[PDB]
Design a protein around this ligand. Structure first.
Ligand code: FES
Ligand SMILES: [K+]
Ligand SMILES: [K+]
Ligand SMILES: [K+]
Ligand SMILES: [K+]
Ligand SMILES: [Mg+2]
Ligand SMILES: [Mg+2]
Ligand SMILES: [Mg+2]
Ligand SMILES: [Mg+2]
Ligand SMILES: [Mg+2]
Ligand SMILES: [Mg+2]
Ligand SMILES: [Mg+2]
Ligand SMILES: [Mg+2]
Ligand SMILES: [Mg+2]
Ligand SMILES: [Mg+2]
Ligand SMILES: [Mg+2]
Ligand SMILES: [Mg+2]
Ligand SMILES: [Mg+2]
Ligand SMILES: [Mg+2]
Ligand SMILES: [Mg+2]
Ligand SMILES: [Mg+2]
Ligand SMILES: [Mg+2]
Ligand SMILES: [Mg+2]
Ligand SMILES: [Mg+2]
Ligand SMILES: [Mg+2]
Lengths: 108, 136, 170, 70
RNA sequence: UACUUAAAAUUUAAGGAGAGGGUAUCAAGCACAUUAAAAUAGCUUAAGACACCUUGCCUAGCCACACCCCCACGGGACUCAGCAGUGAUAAAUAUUAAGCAAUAAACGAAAGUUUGACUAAGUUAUACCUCUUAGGGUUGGUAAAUUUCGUGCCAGCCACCGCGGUCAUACGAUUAACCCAAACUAAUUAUCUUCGGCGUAAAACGUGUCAACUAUAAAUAAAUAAAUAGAAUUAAAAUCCAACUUAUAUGUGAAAAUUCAUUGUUAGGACCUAAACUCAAUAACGAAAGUAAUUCUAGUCAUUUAUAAUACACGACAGCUAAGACCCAAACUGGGAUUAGAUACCCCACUAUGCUUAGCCAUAAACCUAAAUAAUUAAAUUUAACAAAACUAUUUGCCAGAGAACUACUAGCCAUAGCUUAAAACUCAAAGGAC
């Protein structure tokens, strides 16, 4: 662009930073609604443990439960955080082990 | 160990540099000679480029003043029936004698080109040279 | 590569090299120059090189330039008194034009120095406060004075916590 | 290569979709123009009422500019 | 506070050199102006008016607010956005504390009095500092650092690339090592921001003319073979009519259907529909689209140069509307064949349409996939590669990963299954270009 065109336009227009599943918040608290399995996209082959939750914001989201084995059930309370599950499409939240009803993976 | 880079510098500059670095311990025998009696131009690589737009070379077309007279002689009489001998360094052709006489008359002060052309023909006719005014 | 011709003109150092600071009387400077010709070359160079420097040091002066309106280039200054100073810059180099206007309508070095000193009258080195305005925020920074408790713990006897305990003991 | 094929294949699926729902789109349009006309009339009524007139200027009838006048 | 009149601090009102968030799919606002006999028809606006959305900024501090109705006569849902504290809510969690001793403020002539301002404490790894215990994470690559065993595309892991189906340095335990350390790791947010590009990758967006700026500096042009419009004209080949006339004619790879109202010949007649061989191995004209049968009439031309839309005028083909034309061609349609099927390719017939007269539509790989203009050919320039050698300057337009998307919505349009304008959600770690 010419100096006259750069002057008439100024600095580049910047698209606003749209928020993610947590809505720009470190963590959210949600109540479990269902516990189900999600299948990772090929080539990955597994039965990943996830759950649907109703967040404090009022929306409903699908959250991956990390770790080897969870005791979560319907009506339980959990603290969800950000971080997408790469193989699981649409799963943009994860549960924090050791907070509220969810507990640390049971080393056995 | 050497500098086989013939596109950077010259044989002399690369030899000077290699000795400064410490890789070449003995001077080549041709080195001192080049230092004392170098060439006029430094032999450095240059990529020949083409000329573009209105760039032109600077070569003078070699045209002497005799050529104006010689052109008329070839158009009027052609080349002399006697054959050119280009091995004799002092050869005088029929056309060169025409130009020598044409010059002599012009030194006298004749200003008309037509006068100098027909008078020279008459003088050579007296000399006995066979000039044929071949229009063909 | 910076765009345009002579990109050095678009640097703060170049703009600050200008030495023509007009007197308070100067209010407008009209520049009449021709884009084609031979006797107006200095005028064209003055618009190209010097007008930015003049505006930088005289932000409140209106510089308005008109092109190819007259046979010859000239400068006309409009003063606050109502006087109009015409300058003829034909056959004059851009450097010559700057020196001429500096002489007739430019502040002298003495006047400018006095203004600079007066501007800084209220800054005192001894004054304490934020870094933006002062050298030192607190007297603890000074050598020999009691250091800040945050950096160096105070003696117990100089602390209100300790003094209160003794008063209770009394 | 695949970018014109995709424009072609995308454009092919739009023309098919428009054909399947051509009659629905016609009724959508006639209603969007009617709302477009009412919005035009109301915007003109706002002007004279704000100016203080209690009736539209004498001999004025809002032109119907979105109807099948041509 | 001084004088009985002058220095300040502090405000208020009216203003304006300049600077000042986002959306132009917010493009018009609709009285927003001047004059001062009260007339004139003006005022702001692509140099961004108007509308809407969002946000405290100008930081020794400033501005706005003080339960709500912008305000607070009035009304209402009737007061901690003072300190401490409580309920609810939230990922978010300080004492219902002491003293007016210091400084500040209020009051008093004053000794003095008052103050949840403030001061000294309490609470909390949130930070810094000084010390003393050591814990936290990681160990496939980026990126410092793994031994044994279990698991076997399962269980699990990853910021990106990826790992796991029997020798897993990548998962789990264990061993050691690495990093940091009263912290450590995770999540969230923040700090980095246009002088780069536009033949082939995002992007010169069909064509030209008129403005204002920004640049530039010269006083010419035209006289051109197929620009364009009108009128007149016609050579070859068809069509029609007529004479004579084979028995067939037509059609394919091969056949069938079609046909004998055909066929062939005509130095017979009519027609003037449609298209313009050779020239053309040419490279002209026009802004582009486009334009080459002949003749005649009208006709292209000077603005220094570049630079234009919200205006004006054009814009292949196909398509729409109305009245005509119709040799030939030909979507569609029917017939014949072909094939497992033919909804095609091949054959026959025939229509819209191609033509004219009036409008409309405004679309192309509208492409030389090259914006225009003036330079230079050397700057030790294959500055990727391939195209079309490279490159400087000027002005405008345009571009900012891919898909979603020649889409949705918006506005304009003779357009109504239309064109121009043109997003987001969401998804992926690529997409793409040249070799
Ligand atoms: S900053 Fe000076 S005493 Fe703390
Ligand atoms: K896999
Ligand atoms: K209020
Ligand atoms: K006190
Ligand atoms: K381990
Ligand atoms: Mg929209
Ligand atoms: Mg309240
Ligand atoms: Mg109020
Ligand atoms: Mg409180
Ligand atoms: Mg109160
Ligand atoms: Mg906190
Ligand atoms: Mg007092
Ligand atoms: Mg193993
Ligand atoms: Mg790892
Ligand atoms: Mg491991
Ligand atoms: Mg492109
Ligand atoms: Mg187009
Ligand atoms: Mg005709
Ligand atoms: Mg004529
Ligand atoms: Mg027809
Ligand atoms: Mg092309
Ligand atoms: Mg299209
Ligand atoms: Mg569309
Ligand atoms: Mg639309
Ligand atoms: Mg997007």
């Amino acid at each position: 662009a010419t100096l006259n065109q750069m002057h008439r336009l100024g600095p580049r227009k910047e698209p606003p930073k749209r928020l993610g599943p947590t809505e720009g918040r470190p963590q959210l608290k949600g109540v479990v609604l269902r516990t189900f399995i999600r299948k990772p996209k090929k080539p990955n082959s597994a039965n990943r443990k996830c759950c649907r939750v109703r967040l404090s914001t009022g929306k409903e989201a699908v959250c991956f439960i990390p770790g080897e084995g969870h005791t979560l059930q319907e009506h339980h309370v959990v603290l969800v955080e950000g971080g997408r599950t790469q193989d699981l499409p649409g799963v943009k939240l994860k549960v924090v082990r050791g907070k509220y009803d969810c507990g640390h993976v049971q080393k056995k | 160990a050497g500098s086989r880079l013939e596109t950077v510098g010259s044989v002399f500059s690369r030899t000077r540099d290699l000795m400064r670095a410490g890789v070449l311990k003995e001077k080549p025998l041709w080195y001192d000679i080049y230092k004392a009696f170098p060439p006029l131009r430094e032999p450095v690589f240059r990529r020949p480029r083409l000329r573009y737009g209105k760039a032109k070379a600077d070569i003078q077309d070699i045209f002497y003043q005799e050529d104006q007279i010689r052109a008329k002689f070839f158009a009027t009489y052609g080349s002399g029936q006697k054959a050119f001998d280009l091995f004799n360094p002092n050869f005088k052709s029929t056309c060169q004698r025409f130009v020598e006489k044409y010059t002599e008359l012009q030194n006298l002060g004749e200003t008309d080109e037509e006068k100098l052309f027909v008078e020279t023909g008459k003088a050579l006719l007296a000399e006995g040279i066979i000039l044929r005014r071949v229009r063909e | 590569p910076m765009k345009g011709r002579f990109p050095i003109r678009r640097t703060l150092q170049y703009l600050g090299r200008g030495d023509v600071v007009f007197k308070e009387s100067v209010k407008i400077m009209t520049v009449n120059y021709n884009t084609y010709g031979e006797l107006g070359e200095g005028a064209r160079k003055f618009v190209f090189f010097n007008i930015p420097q003049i505006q930088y040091k005289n932000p409140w002066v209106q510089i308005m330039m008109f092109k190819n309106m007259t046979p010859s280039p000239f400068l006309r200054f409009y003063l606050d008194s109502g006087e109009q100073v015409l300058v003829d810059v034909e056959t004059k180099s851009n450097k010559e034009i700057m020196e001429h206007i500096k002489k007739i309508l430019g502040k002298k070095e003495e006047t400018l120095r006095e203004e600079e000193l007066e501007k800084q009258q209220r800054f005192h080195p001894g004054n304490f406060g934020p870094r933006k305005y002062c050298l030192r925020e607190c007297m603890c920074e000074v050598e020999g004075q009691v250091p800040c408790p945050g950096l160096v713990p105070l003696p117990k006897e100089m602390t209100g916590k300790y003094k209160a305990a003794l008063k209770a003991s009394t | 290569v695949l970018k014109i094929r995709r424009r072609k294949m995308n454009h092919h699926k739009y023309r098919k979709l428009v054909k399947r729902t051509r009659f629905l789109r016609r009724k959508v349009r006639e209603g969007r123009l009617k709302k477009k006309q009412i919005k035009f009339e109301k915007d003109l009524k706002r002007i004279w009422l704000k100016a203080g007139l209690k009736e539209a200027p004498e001999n004025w009838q809002t032109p119907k500019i979105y109807l099948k006048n041509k």
